[PDB]
Amino acid sequence: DSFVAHFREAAPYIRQMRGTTLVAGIDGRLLEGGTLNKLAADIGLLSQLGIRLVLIHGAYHFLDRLAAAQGRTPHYCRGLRVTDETSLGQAQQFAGTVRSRFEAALCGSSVPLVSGNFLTARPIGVIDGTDMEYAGVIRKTDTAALRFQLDAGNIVWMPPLGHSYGGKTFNLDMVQAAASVAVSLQAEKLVYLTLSDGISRPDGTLAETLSAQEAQSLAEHAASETRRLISSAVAALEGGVHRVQILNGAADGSLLQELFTRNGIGTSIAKEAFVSIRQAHSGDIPHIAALIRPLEEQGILLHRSREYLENHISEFSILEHDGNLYGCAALKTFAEADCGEIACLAVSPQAQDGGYGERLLAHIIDKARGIGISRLFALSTNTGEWFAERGFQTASEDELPETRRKDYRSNGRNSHILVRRLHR
Amino acid sequence: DSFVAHFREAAPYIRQMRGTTLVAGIDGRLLEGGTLNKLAADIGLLSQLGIRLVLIHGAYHFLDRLAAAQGRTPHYCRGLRVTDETSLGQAQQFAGTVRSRFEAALCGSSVPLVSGNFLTARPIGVIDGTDMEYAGVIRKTDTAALRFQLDAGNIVWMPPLGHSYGGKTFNLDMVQAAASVAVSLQAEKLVYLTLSDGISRPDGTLAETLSAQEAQSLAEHAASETRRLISSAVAALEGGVHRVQILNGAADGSLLQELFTRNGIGTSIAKEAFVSIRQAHSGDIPHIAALIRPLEEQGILLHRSREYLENHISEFSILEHDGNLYGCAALKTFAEADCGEIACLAVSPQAQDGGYGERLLAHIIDKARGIGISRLFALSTNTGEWFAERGFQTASEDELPETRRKDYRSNGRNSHILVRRLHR
Amino acid sequence: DSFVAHFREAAPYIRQMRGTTLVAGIDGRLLEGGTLNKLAADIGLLSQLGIRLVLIHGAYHFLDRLAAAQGRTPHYCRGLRVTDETSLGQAQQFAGTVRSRFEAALCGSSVPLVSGNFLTARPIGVIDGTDMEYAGVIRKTDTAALRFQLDAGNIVWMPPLGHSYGGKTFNLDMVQAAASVAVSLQAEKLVYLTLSDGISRPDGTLAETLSAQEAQSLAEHAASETRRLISSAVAALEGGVHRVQILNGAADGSLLQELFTRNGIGTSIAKEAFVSIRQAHSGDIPHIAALIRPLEEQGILLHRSREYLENHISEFSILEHDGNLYGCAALKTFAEADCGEIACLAVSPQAQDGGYGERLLAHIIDKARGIGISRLFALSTNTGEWFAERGFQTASEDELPETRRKDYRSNGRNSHILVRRLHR
Amino acid sequence: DSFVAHFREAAPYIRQMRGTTLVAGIDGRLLEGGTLNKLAADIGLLSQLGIRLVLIHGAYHFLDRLAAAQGRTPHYCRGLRVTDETSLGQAQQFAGTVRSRFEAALCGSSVPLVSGNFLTARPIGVIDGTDMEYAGVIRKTDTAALRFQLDAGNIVWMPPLGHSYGGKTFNLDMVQAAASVAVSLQAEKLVYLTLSDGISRPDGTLAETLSAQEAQSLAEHAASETRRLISSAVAALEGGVHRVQILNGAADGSLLQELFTRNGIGTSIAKEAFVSIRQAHSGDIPHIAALIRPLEEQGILLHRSREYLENHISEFSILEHDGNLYGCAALKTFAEADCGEIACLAVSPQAQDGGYGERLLAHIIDKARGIGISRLFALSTNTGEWFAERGFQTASEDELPETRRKDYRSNGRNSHILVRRLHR
Numbered sequence A, B, C, D: 001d002s003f004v005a006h007f008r009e010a011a012p013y014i015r016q017m018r019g020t021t022l023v024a025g026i027d028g029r030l031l032e033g034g035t036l037n038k039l040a041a042d043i044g045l046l047s048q049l050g051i052r053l054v055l056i057h058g059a060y061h062f063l064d065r066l067a068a069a070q071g072r073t074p075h076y077c078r079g080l081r082v083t084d085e086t087s088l089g090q091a092q093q094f095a096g097t098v099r100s101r102f103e104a105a106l107c108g109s110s111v112p113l114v115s116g117n118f119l120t121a122r123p124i125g126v127i128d129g130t131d132m133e134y135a136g137v138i139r140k141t142d143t144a145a146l147r148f149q150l151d152a153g154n155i156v157w158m159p160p161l162g163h164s165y166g167g168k169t170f171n172l173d174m175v176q177a178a179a180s181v182a183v184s185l186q187a188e189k190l191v192y193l194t195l196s197d198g199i200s201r202p203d204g205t206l207a208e209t210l211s212a213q214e215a216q217s218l219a220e221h222a223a224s225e226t227r228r229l230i231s232s233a234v235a236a237l238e239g240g241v242h243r244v245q246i247l248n249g250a251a252d253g254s255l256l257q258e259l260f261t262r263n264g265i266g267t268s269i270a271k272e273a274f275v276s277i278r279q280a281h282s283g284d285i286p287h288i289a290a291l292i293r294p295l296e297e298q299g300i301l302l303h304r305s306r307e308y309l310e311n312h313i314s315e316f317s318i319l320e321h322d323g324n325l326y327g328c329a330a331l332k333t334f335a336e337a338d339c340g341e342i343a344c345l346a347v348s349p350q351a352q353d354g355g356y357g358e359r360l361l362a363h364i365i366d367k368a369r370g371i372g373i374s375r376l377f378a379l380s381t382n383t384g385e386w387f388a389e390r391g392f393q394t395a396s397e398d399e400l401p402e403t404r405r406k407d408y409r410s411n412g413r414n415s416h417i418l419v420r421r422l423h424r
């Protein structure tokens, strides 16, 4: 495929990723092989594409490679590596040689790269009667300082080391350092660059996209390591991060291909914000009426009525928060078994603009589909593009279900008509 | 070829083009067909890639399309279209419908797009007894205002219309408006988006790259239109612009492919700054000595001598400005007919850092090559990377011409040795 | 009258209008005659006087002038002109020739003038079974971009055209575009430059100033056009704009004379914020007591008492929001039928500083006046200037009603005394 | 001595050192002992006192401590340590453990500390037939980036490592890295924190202050190490740095005591800018006349004359640049052998304000003193404070030498009279 076409494809993801903040937690194996030059390069490019970068690396696998081979053996607890004064000493060494090679590798393939005492750690203390010693976790993170450097366009490099006010240095767990740093920054995107093609489902297939929930539920049968990715990824999301990804950093160019294709090459994970949508029943009707009535008076909605509603209350859905009714949507059906209609779609003007409408539309389309409906219509007098923009084609009178074509004729409204093909 | 590989290729040109200013002069035919959506898109992307954009369009072909078809016939003079009060009136119309379609087309494929009274025109007046009437040329261009908008990241749109202080509006020639605007902005790059795959040489082949000189000399036998491109492109360059390009705007994605590949798809043109390099002769020697001597005292250069030089003054070149000697370089030869050496390469410390060294290196390599030399050596004690960076590989003692290997041994200097393969 | 005196008069309105934002909706007839040079000039001056300017123009009258004269006839619906693909095409033309003439006219009488894709439209869709086609209304307005340009001192020019995300361009109604833009900007002032000396009352007299309410009520018997001015002017105000004006843009210099004289030459309209003020009755007394008591303990208010109040509860007014009592004020009377006193004026410290005090003062003065009172006194120990500033002159003991002069003597407070002449 | 008095003493040096840039080159032994906490603390304080800090550390002594103890033995050349791929590897380790301890030590005694890829090195190459291998020197130093961080108030930390464009990392000599960095920054002050109480004179006494010249001349008989301090300190100065100091970083609190006392505790070094001052002779007189005459016409100088001057040309000095005469000053003597007068002090108005006047004053006072003069008078009608400010006390008529008191009386000028006691 041609250059121009690849470039024209990436264009939209470049748009999206621009001026946005991307926290990367990098396995330290990656900072060592031939795999490091590829990765620094891909990261220069990101910088070039106007993405704000914070980069954090781990040390566990290097330490052990030095441990097992010193005679000693590392214990982990809940995953967290007990770190003594000698391991801590090597982690300080490992960080200097890494930060320096990554620098060279980046300078060799004028991109400004900045490191900082942005972190204050406290020791994790004791877990299940075990002194973790120098194992830290982040107590404070100098957010203003960081934004300042990202504002200026510097790529931030962070080793897995914080300092405490007592003048002691602690060893930080990369995986949950990064996620903590992302939540501080409210970064749009946390990326973990592992040695694995993402997270696998119950049977060997790699999980392309997952809700925090699905992620959660894969964990019960998942391996230590991928279990802790999942929790930090879940916590990063609930903490405000928009999207956390898992890639194989060792696979050539994966970062690019993940960020700037319609496809990807790893797992990505997203949080399903709260919205209780359910089958309307007898009690909603006064609410729905109050919601519906203003609109049905402006001419934006067909005029309904207590009995209309009372007798079709089953074809309606409502969206609710805290007992409060914020929206509704109904599915009409027809003698044509393939057809359907989104009807009576309404969100309160107060609670508008946060994807409520969308959620009801989606919901209905799930329901139209569970009954073998494959074309969904939507007619509208002042709102057509909401649907044109969200996957509906223009249609004519002659295309409606026969009956709906009758009503349409003797409406007098001339609503615009649209449809959207639903998928099996 | 894979995505990642295309992207990894563009990466360097993205680096270069970033934060840089690109003035585009666009034929107005392009703002009309299906060719406009492609082009707006490609231009959104540029914006996305951090390039400062100023865009200017023409009107000549639209006017005439309206003229010939009104009964009237346009005269041009030296290429400049006499424009009456009615043509001027239509150009104002044409500009509003263009700026608005390009807007829609860009909004449809959140990129900020800004238009401005940045130009003050005066009428061209009379040429060869002919009143050009409303044909303007730019008298002043509000540069601070423009930088301000580019600083903020707006894409600047400019119609081919300026206003004069007497309250009159003039019609501007696109081709030399853009080049004028670029010189004001000192833009790095002026791009002309024509209906032609660039400029053709004496025999049908498209001229990939050209010096302003070669450009110049193609003009004597070239067609009106491409003659005026050439002059404005020459004037833009001498006026300070770094590089002017000519592409076919109608060819799909050409802009991208031009800017972000090692290849291209149009013509590009560059100015050969002034440097008089010539065969050293008897008179230079005191100069060369003064230049050479400090260095030959620090140990950076083999030690020469009046007679050494006097008897080999033919193997030397010198670089000179205003009778002043600013650098030198010599080509040694050997019993091996394929071999050569760059020797005695020196630029004054005052006049360093502007590509003087490079120019002498190049020069010598032209000369080594005109005598069938295909490997050029360079030995150096403190300056090796200058050559490693500029296309030389490391070598060993055992690889030198036999004689030079002798001298090398009984030097005691241990110079590093490098070579570079010259091309037929 | 002398220069200096005119200038010294304008000085205060210049103070007020400085650094303030003024959205102007301009009838497009104005952009055409000799009336355009005058108007551009007056608008340069505004810019010179440090006023932030956004200017938006209409197209309806031009379109029709082209329509009726093409054979075709425009339908309007609720005032909104159905606009086809050919009208939309001309509106794009009309905008380019206008923006360009206004530019020339402004450049001819160095004031920076900036145009922008600040608007995203959606089509109005269908009204009363009628496809409005390309008739848009503004869906989003890039407010940050606009403030940015106004911050820099540019005059913003806006044609009556937005674009939609589907890549289509819509025709915008000027009158309610401007008001929408003002509300976005929260501009202090929206000015509509019409062809009429403002809005006329029930009997031929031009309405100098009006509350949104009075405006509203003039509408029931008013003409289509002036009916829609009124609604957009009402909506702009409720939407947050401080003041909307209606002038005759064709009348020479009206804009100046409107903005910088104590008088004006058109209609102006202002919103009466919410304040329920009413006759105190038996139930308020505990509230009034709690409000009054702290103050009556600091020495700022004469000391009252349950019975005092109980027996004069008729001379009191209270101000209330949401059943909450936020202030009070009483009118005392005297054997002198011309006299009155503002007594017991108090607002809670929480709800202070928003013109509550003023509203009660006003209120009382309405009431003093409805009983033929023409001098209102106010005595005060620590608050005299509140009244000196708000239209009261200093007075002496010997000027009080005889009885109040008695009380004053044997007070011991030495309150300052002031008065204000009320008008028939 | 009391707190207040110490603080009131430091106040002036705090004034001077504020907002000023201080580059510190630190021996790496210092980053290790108990000596590190003291030093980080003193450096926090500096930061607190508004001084811009760049800090750079060495590695030579650590490397060798690892070398001698590995079996290997380091060669130095001209002082520069040949560094192989394994030493370079350890220097990367040493830098990470240092930067991290200094961090902890600073965090333990909220001061922001910033590290950066500010340096690009090239290898030193070959010296006297010896491959220095990975021994670098700085080729480019990102000055804008550095000022940016100092502007923001960050303390800059720099390890002794740069990177080259070929993707290789080099080992930098601390001593001449710092001085190079200072010259780039044009820092006011370069401080070298050694293990020695400054530089010793020919006989064991520590050299408090030295001109670059005196420094220079101490070097001929000085030890390798202190020889290279001297050259880098000389080059930093000629390169534009205002003042370079040498202290014992291991001595407790020396940095403070050096910077904020009238005394110090180490050596300091300063450059004697160019000014040729010499005994006036017959040829200067026309110059001196032209210089003198305007002034002698304004009344600022006693009126002289060709013969006056011709016959006393020995009591005059002149200051000259490039054969050009820019100033003059004369010493009068008296029957009182202790007395003297500065007479005829004049600098051209063009070349004023750069300490020329001062230099002539000094000069004369050297000359008055070499003839046993211990009081120097200066009389002046419009210039008294120049002398009051520069160490002269007010005097009366009755205090002048007897003869000068005569002239003074029958002048009519009433010059102010001042004196200054010169020291044996």
Ligand SMILES: CC(C)(COP(=O)(O)OP(=O)(O)OC[C@H]1O[C@@H](n2cnc3c(N)ncnc32)[C@H](O)[C@@H]1OP(=O)(O)O)[C@H](O)C(=O)NCCC(=O)NCCS
Binding pocket: A295, A300, A344, A345, A346, A347, A348, A351, A352, A353, A354, A355, A356, A357, A358, A359, A379, A380, A381, A382, A383, A384, A385, A386, C122, C139
């Ligand atoms: C259309 C509606 C139901 C969407 O509800 P919502 O919860 O705001 O929906 P979402 O937040 O998912 O989408 C909001 C977005 O849709 C856009 N939208 C809202 N009204 C629009 C319209 N009439 N035309 C086009 N787009 C519109 C909003 O501008 C907003 O744009 P953005 O994505 O660039 O911010 C709307 O809120 C509503 O109730 N309008 C009046 C009732 C109506 O038209 N109902 C049925 C139509 S037949």
Ligand SMILES: CC(C)(COP(=O)(O)OP(=O)(O)OC[C@H]1O[C@@H](n2cnc3c(N)ncnc32)[C@H](O)[C@@H]1OP(=O)(O)O)[C@H](O)C(=O)NCCC(=O)NCCS
Binding pocket: B295, B300, B344, B345, B346, B347, B348, B351, B352, B353, B354, B355, B356, B357, B358, B359, B379, B380, B381, B382, B383, B384, B385, B386, D122, D139
């Ligand atoms: C090498 C030299 C001749 C280049 O001359 P020049 O006119 O400055 O050459 P150019 O301007 O084309 O190239 C200058 C660039 O080369 C780089 N350069 C200069 N000396 C360098 C060196 N010793 N090592 C690596 N790069 C060096 C400069 O840093 C500058 O870097 P930049 O491209 O990132 O700005 C140099 O100026 C010189 O005379 N040095 C001393 C003499 C010497 O070494 N002569 C022969 C070497 S065997």
Ligand SMILES: CC(C)(COP(=O)(O)OP(=O)(O)OC[C@H]1O[C@@H](n2cnc3c(N)ncnc32)[C@H](O)[C@@H]1OP(=O)(O)O)[C@H](O)C(=O)NCCC(=O)NCCS
Binding pocket: C295, C300, C344, C345, C346, C347, C348, C351, C352, C353, C354, C355, C356, C357, C358, C359, C379, C380, C381, C382, C383, C384, C385, C386
């Ligand atoms: C005087 C008072 C009743 C005004 O109430 P209010 O609702 O704040 O009145 P407004 O908001 O219309 O006017 C507020 C302004 O009046 C000014 N004002 C308030 N107290 C003032 C005083 N004692 N002297 C002068 N001006 C005063 C406020 O500073 C504010 O100034 P600004 O216009 O530059 O912002 C005041 O709030 C109050 O109750 N003070 C104590 C009670 C008292 O003095 N009552 C009667 C006086 S005899």
Ligand SMILES: CC(C)(COP(=O)(O)OP(=O)(O)OC[C@H]1O[C@@H](n2cnc3c(N)ncnc32)[C@H](O)[C@@H]1OP(=O)(O)O)[C@H](O)C(=O)NCCC(=O)NCCS
Binding pocket: D295, D300, D344, D345, D346, D347, D348, D351, D352, D353, D354, D355, D356, D357, D358, D359, D379, D380, D381, D382, D383, D384, D385, D386
């Ligand atoms: C006084 C003079 C000789 C000093 O020469 P100079 O080379 O400028 O001396 P310096 O640069 O060392 O000192 C310059 C400073 O002295 C100050 N100075 C100059 N004239 C001054 C005066 N008349 N009163 C007080 N200070 C003065 C300048 O303002 C400048 O102030 P700064 O230290 O805050 O910048 C002056 O330049 C001069 O020639 N003035 C007229 C001739 C004259 O008065 N000669 C003899 C006086 S009896």
Ligand SMILES: CC(=O)N[C@@H](CCC(=O)O)C(=O)O
Binding pocket: A300, A301, A302, A303, A342, A343, A344, A345, A346, A378, A379, A380, A381, A413, A414, A415, A416
């Ligand atoms: C999608 C939607 O809510 N449609 C409106 C009908 C609009 C019309 O038919 O013209 C409804 O009443 O269901």
Ligand SMILES: CC(=O)N[C@@H](CCC(=O)O)C(=O)O
Binding pocket: B300, B301, B302, B303, B342, B343, B344, B345, B346, B378, B379, B380, B381, B413, B414, B415, B416
């Ligand atoms: C390229 C160059 O100028 N070389 C130096 C030689 C350096 C050496 O041989 O060690 C020259 O004298 O020609």
Ligand SMILES: CC(=O)N[C@@H](CCC(=O)O)C(=O)O
Binding pocket: C300, C301, C302, C303, C342, C343, C344, C345, C346, C378, C379, C380, C381, C413, C414, C415, C416
């Ligand atoms: C205006 C007002 O509220 N006055 C205070 C009286 C102040 C006085 O008389 O000194 C009042 O009690 O009515």
Ligand SMILES: CC(=O)N[C@@H](CCC(=O)O)C(=O)O
Binding pocket: D300, D301, D302, D303, D342, D343, D344, D345, D346, D378, D379, D380, D381, D413, D414, D415, D416
């Ligand atoms: C210091 C100096 O130059 N003095 C002036 C004299 C000023 C006076 O005596 O009043 C001089 O002629 O020497």
